[PDB]
């Protein structure tokens, strides 16, 4: 956020439209998502905080598959 | 949606502000959430479709605890 670019774009910064999340992790506490990109094979990790707001519908859709209500 | 009220309000219709989801299930395919209500002990189930749009931030927050990335 402060200066993710500077030389190379990453995640949403890349500009690529998020098709559907296909990954999840965490840097050191905050959750993460390996967001997918339209017409782009190579994806990119995006902070859970950024995804769960810029793409609420998308992130929510992802959980559906990787749920665990049992 | 067609006429949930008619005589008695349920879920978001009640008007109560959703504090934090504390439940999840499914009628017959579509996921569900036992949405909580501000200054209200008695909660109420709300369709996943309604919650994952009217309260994206809330629903997303709920998954955080009930995750399963492993």
**Looking at chain A, which residue has its C-alpha nearest residue B31?**
A64
What CATH topology corresponds to A1-70? OB fold (Dihydrolipoamide Acetyltransferase, E2P) (2.40.50)
Question: Would you state the structure tokens that stand for residue B43, as one six-digit string?
Answer: 């909660």
What is the rounded distance in angstroms from the CA atom of residue B24 to the CA atom of residue B62? Answer: 10
Question: How are beta strands A46-47 and B24-26 bridged, if at all?
Answer: unpaired
Judged by DSSP in three states, B53 sits in helix
DSSP string, A7-62: TS--GGGG-PPB-----EEESSSSEEE---BTTBSS---EEHHHHHHHSHHHHHHH
Judged by DSSP in three states, B13 sits in helix
CB contact under 8 A, B69 and A66: yes
Q: How was this structure determined?
A: NMR
> Which of A56, A60, A68 is opposite residue B66, by nearest beta carbon?
A68
What is the rounded distance in angstroms from the CA atom of residue B52 to the CA atom of residue B48? Answer: 6
Which secondary-structure segment (H or E) carries B40? none
Which residue of A49, A67, A70 to mutate against B (max B Cβ within 10 Å)? A67
8 Å CB contact between B51 and B21: yes
Dihedral, A63, A44, A25, A64 alpha carbons, nearest 10: 10
In chain A, domain spans: 1-70
What is the rounded distance in angstroms from the CA atom of residue A66 to the CA atom of residue B6? Answer: 36
Question: Residue B7: left if φ>0, alpha if ψ -120 to 50, beta else—which one?
Answer: alpha
What is the rounded distance in angstroms from the CA atom of residue B28 to the CA atom of residue B32? Answer: 10
């Amino acid at each position: 956020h402060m200066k993710e670019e500077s030389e190379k774009p990453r995640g949403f910064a890349r500009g690529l439209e998020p098709e559907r999340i296909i990954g999840a992790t965490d840097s050191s506490g905050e959750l993460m998502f390996l967001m997918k990109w339209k017409n782009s094979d190579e994806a990119d990790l995006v902070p859970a905080k950024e995804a769960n707001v810029k793409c609420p519908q998308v992130v929510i859709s992802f959980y559906e598959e990787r749920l665990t209500w049992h």
